[PDB]
């Protein structure tokens, strides 16, 4: 009775909150941006996105080297190292690189988003630029939000490259695979409009979700350094409850 | 106007469980999606490996789904029930036109019109309003047999026309059926 | 707000529950229960790569787990016991008189009245006293004998029924079977 | 990472039993012949424990 009814009045401010943030999302993008906001927009590319880039790769290498390592040992079995190329292919380009990409970048770029808000905060960096008047929605969220949306896929591409690249490192280097049934698995298999296109509108509401809740739960939070740590798992927590809980989504209305 | 940010925060809630049902459409495991499906029903004595959600073909084209697989054990025979997508099973105002003067001249023909009741104006409509009541496609004598997908592939249901003279409405049964094939017995028959 | 925190709670609470439940189902025990599950016996010689918990099927559906298989050593003889399910099997009181009905035209037949008195004072009550208790679907012809789904599948028992006479009872050892063949006498009949 | 992979196995189960039909009696003694316990399971913690 008591916690039960502590527990709904939670639920319900959290959904309340939540719609706010929709009513936050609105007034930032139906504005023009005022000269001076693409240096730092830049700028902000030059922190998420690039600072991000030497991390992709390596997990990127990691990937396919593990996945055509193991199914080929029980697939050479009957017929087939042929299916290879076609089997690392098309579970990289339609299934993980629009989810393994995001979990990572919700990592690295999904809290500093926050932090760099929950750095404003706490020492009132926010309140005085209210009161020497800008309007921190317009200075440092609007630069910081559509960096996100743009460098998302513009790694997540990056990495399912090196992670293709990488499977055939171990095949034709250690494995000694056959080089023109690897490529012309592929190219039968695996079409451009359907895969490759659909990979990419994929990872763009996979960088939205992962992007905005990464701005608005680092602005709306009190500025106790206890609850920077829980404002920030609810970045983490409702990023990656809803990266897979919009996979599901996505898998059914392109395919099946 | 504090409740304005909850009401949206409710608007977005419900909407978004409510795109997350409609990509349960598509998706094929929840609903089908088949404009005006109708049922239908066979009888076979061996369905082995013949799994619920199979695919019906006419010459290729998957024209079905396959819902529940039952016995009666008082015959000891199966019973497949299914449904067809039909707005390409079924006919329309070409077709109809086409296949109610077909069999009325061919079926009906000198065979069978010239033998016959003694006033041949209420019977020639006869011919044809048996036939607008929802006519599929198949014939008298096509049969339905299960396949195996190529060499290694999973059994599904192959409808294959006979030509015939006479159709079947949405309800009835296919009455010339066959079950799988098997290996145990062909090699002991062959060896 | 007693309202809100209350509903609240309701939503939440209930959700919660049902969900464990069902995920917890899903998963080992739990659920996993048929009903009127049965129990017979056959003897082989050479079962092959069979396992427990594997498929028993009377057309090509499927009716039942396999339980134990266990190797009789003084005639070199494995023994498996399986259970059945007793919704998809055992006839029906109406399939009772309608199995009675047909054995008054099988087991009190003209002619098999026929064959040793004409008035079945020891014949119609023999053939009525087993049959409340007990009777089975499978007959008393029917062989079983094992397949194994195509090329390499899972090793699952076959129920050929056999068009016989009377039936069996919830408990009795299928006499008639037949082992499965494996592939290394394929080889050799092959040449 | 054990809690992990226990529904990790168990969800794989809910698309196979309950949607592709698939046999449960080979669904897990396809399991139960490959994966021993001290190579594989308790080999999957030693990794674990200097992951963490």
Redesign the interface.
Known sequence: ?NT?????????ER??????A??MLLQIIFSLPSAGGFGRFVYQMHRVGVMSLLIITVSGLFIGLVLGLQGYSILVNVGSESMLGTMVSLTLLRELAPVVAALLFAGRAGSALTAEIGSMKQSEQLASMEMIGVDPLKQIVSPRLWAGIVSLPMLTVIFAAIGIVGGKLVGVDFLGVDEGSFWSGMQNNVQFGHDVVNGIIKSIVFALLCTWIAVFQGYACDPTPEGIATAMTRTVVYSSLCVL?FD??????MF? | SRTSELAVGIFVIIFGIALFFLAMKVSGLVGTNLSDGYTMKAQFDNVNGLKPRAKVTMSGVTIGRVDSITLDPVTRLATVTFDLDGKLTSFNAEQLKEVQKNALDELRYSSDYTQATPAQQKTMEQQLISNMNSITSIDEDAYIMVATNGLLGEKYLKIVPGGGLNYLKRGDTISNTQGTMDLEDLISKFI
């Not at chain 1, 039960?4 to 319900?12: P, S, T």
């Not at chain 1, 959904?15 to 706010?20: E, M, W």
């Open positions: 009775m039960i009814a502590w527990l709904g009045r939670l639920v319900i959904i309340r909150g939540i719609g706010v929709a009513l809980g599901f989504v996505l898998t059914a209305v099946g």
